[PDB]
Amino acid sequence: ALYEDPPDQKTSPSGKPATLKICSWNVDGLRAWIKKKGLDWVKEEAPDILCLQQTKCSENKLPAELQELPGLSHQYWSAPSDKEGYSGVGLLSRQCPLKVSYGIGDEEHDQEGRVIVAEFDSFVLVTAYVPNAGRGLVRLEYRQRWDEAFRKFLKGLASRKPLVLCGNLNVAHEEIDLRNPKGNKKNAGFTPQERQGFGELLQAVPLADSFRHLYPNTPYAYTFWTYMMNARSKNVGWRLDYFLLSHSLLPALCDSKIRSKALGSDHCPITLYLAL
DNA sequence: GCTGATGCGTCGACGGATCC
DNA sequence: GGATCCGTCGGGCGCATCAGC
Ligand SMILES: [Cl-]
Ligand SMILES: [Cl-]
Ligand SMILES: [Cl-]
Ligand SMILES: [Cl-]
Ligand SMILES: [Cl-]
Ligand SMILES: [Cl-]
Secondary structure: OOOOOOOOOOEOOOOOEOOEEEEEEEOOOHHHHHHOOHHHHHHHHOOOEEEEEOOOOOHHHOOHHHHOOHHHOEEEEEOOOOOOOOOOEEEEEOOOOOEEEEOOOOOOOOOOOOEEEEEOOOOEEEEEEOOOOOHHHOOHHHHHHHHHHHHHHHHHHHOOOOEEEEEEOOOOOOHHHEOOOHHHOOOOOOOHHHHHHHHHHHHHOOOEEHHHHHOOOOOOOOOEOOOHHHHHHHOOOEOOEEEEEOHHHHHHEEEEEEOOOOOOOOEOOEEEEEOO
16 A cells, blocks of 8 residues: 655646646644755755745744755745744745735734745745644634635635645545545544535635546555654555646646655655646 | 753554444 | 454654753
């Protein structure tokens, strides 16, 4: 039940070469991840745009190593005001975005540090660290309300420029998206409510799941494994990290990768190749 | 300033019952 | 009586705060 991500496809269905490489990585403690050489892997991957989630780091505490990325020199960071040490997201880009914003409507009052929006010439990029439903589903109702607020927010944005949404969306959409579907239907990340919310997200905005679009029947493809019980060595995992795309961008889609071998978090990186 | 405790956030292994 | 279903329970990791020094 191990998994080998197939080779990188770097040309679109119409034969156009990839021009844009976006990497998304839920790093689960940015400072720890850097100590575990996460930036060395990033340099090898050489993305045009790097989106990070669960940084657990306010901007004043960013390691200096992050100042020595000449190919990712435009950097935007967010962290929650009243929950330091949790959430936190970042977006780093080769080229300067046209516009950058934070949160999903009222960040200035509910500084949550979970979402960054960056508008580029031909698309809008959103990265998100979606709220976990919590152990015992204690925060599932909050998650459901957040899912609705986020859908409404994104519908707004995609009504003008094509959208790319990436990050830790904290749900395995369908049974194929985790190793143990039967045992986890009452656990955060695989409740009927969260799965429904993801389906409504695809239909309402609308968006497509880039990986599943390309690999509709491929099992055992995950992006998260608990640190407990050696799960990663057994590939007992969940696909929690996505690139979701406006349908108008599917002709630009070259590939959507899962970088299973890259260590330094309990999530692995995912990478998108677009021909723009 | 430093270490290590505690707090907080964040499911697969296992044993036993049930299915035919 | 092997496969499957089901409920219980021990438990890695990062970071903030705190105690001790
Ligand atoms: Cl967190
Ligand atoms: Cl938010
Ligand atoms: Cl999907
Ligand atoms: Cl363990
Ligand atoms: Cl994915
Ligand atoms: Cl792939």
